[PDB]
């Protein structure tokens, strides 16, 4: 029973070193990966704290050690996300300055292409709608309008998909 | 009818200049502010495209111009979010390097304090639970365990709140 608590305290004072001065990337988690890790580890910690209290109350020491170890693992990943998220917050500040790596420019390109495609298609949609407003008796242009609306819909779906990961 | 379409095309080719080379902060939107702006402008654009097609079909030119202008405003804010989000993606890459501004270090501090408080409280919770596991007949320590669980719950709520804005 004491070993599970001793090891948990040793791991907790080690993972706090990330929180002391986080000015460098801790891991490869995005800002959404950090929050998702916080949400999942919070649910794991919530049931782990429940198991800690109940098994200490019921004298169920084996399951108590499992709850202690589960809580330790949850708290470590909880801080790895908070440490990386704290790094991303200060770096994403408008008054900061950053040199963008080639792998960074390769990651923002799927967002730039999808947005520039949307303006190109939405422009042609407005150009087509400008003529349909004067003369809607134009079956070919309604096909062109539908074609641009299809490229707009795809460019937006691919833009949101590029940001959620 | 033509003016609403001409002004929309002029605004669209102006806002695309943000997409050409986004290596600087465009606005004060966070990465969550960028995605939220994309989601809201997508709903506005969806109904605007509906109004563009229907009013061109029905010859309702005044409401057609309103739909064109609404679509133009939606597409501009749509790209202002994508341009800033593209900047944040490449800057948040682990292989990048960034000088963090004082206002940036002031924004990550609410995340760092809430996380370091959580480890401090969860450590005391495990320390208290270690004794309750041996002797649960300790009313004062159950109050101490409840006190640390209250500080853990508050530090986690304040940590998530610091990241969602």
């Amino acid at each position: 029973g004491q070993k599970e608590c001793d090891n948990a305290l040793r791991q907790l004072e080690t993972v706090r070193e990330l929180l002391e001065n986080p000015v460098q990337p801790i891991n490869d988690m995005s800002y959404f990966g950090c929050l998702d890790s916080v949400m999942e580890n919070s649910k794991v910690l919530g049931e782990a704290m429940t198991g800690i209290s109940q098994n200490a109350k019921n004298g169920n020491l084996p399951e108590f050690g499992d709850a202690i170890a589960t809580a330790s693992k949850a708290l470590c990943g909880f801080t790895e996300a908070a440490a990386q998220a704290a790094y991303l917050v200060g770096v994403s500040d408008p008054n900061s300055q950053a040199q963008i790596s080639p792998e960074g420019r390769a990651a923002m390109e799927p967002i730039v292409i999808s947005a520039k495609t949307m303006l190109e298609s939405a422009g042609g949609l407005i150009q087509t709608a400008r003529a349909l407003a004067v003369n809607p008796r134009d079956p070919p242009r309604w096909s062109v309008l539908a074609g641009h609306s299809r490229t707009v819909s795809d460019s937006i779906k691919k833009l949101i998909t590029s940001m959620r990961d | 009818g033509q003016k609403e379409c001409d002004n929309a095309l002029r605004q669209l080719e102006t806002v695309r200049e943000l997409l050409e080379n986004p290596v600087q902060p465009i606005n004060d939107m966070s990465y969550f502010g960028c995605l939220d702006s994309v989601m809201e402008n997508s709903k506005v654009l969806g109904e605007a495209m509906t109004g563009i097609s229907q009013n061109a079909k029905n010859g309702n030119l005044p409401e057609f111009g309103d739909a064109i202008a609404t679509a133009s405003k939606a597409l501009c804010g749509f790209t202002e979010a994508a341009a800033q989000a593209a900047y944040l993606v490449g800057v948040s890459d682990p292989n990048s390097q960034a000088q963090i501004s004082p206002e940036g270090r002031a924004a990550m501090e609410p995340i760092v304090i809430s996380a370091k408080t959580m480890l401090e409280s969860a450590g005391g919770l495990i320390q208290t639970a270690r004794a309750l596991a041996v002797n649960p007949r300790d009313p004062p320590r159950w109050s101490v365990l409840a006190g640390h669980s209250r500080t853990v719950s508050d530090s986690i709520k304040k940590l998530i709140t610091s990241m969602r804005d």
Partner: peptide, 24 residues
């Protein structure tokens, strides 16, 4: 809602609105 029937049988693609609703 995820599509709009235009004249002459063509469709206005609004599947990106379906993508937004499935997320939320």
């Amino acid at each position: 809602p995820y599509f709009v029937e235009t004249p002459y049988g063509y469709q206005l693609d609004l599947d990106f609105l379906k993508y937004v609703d499935d997320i939320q």
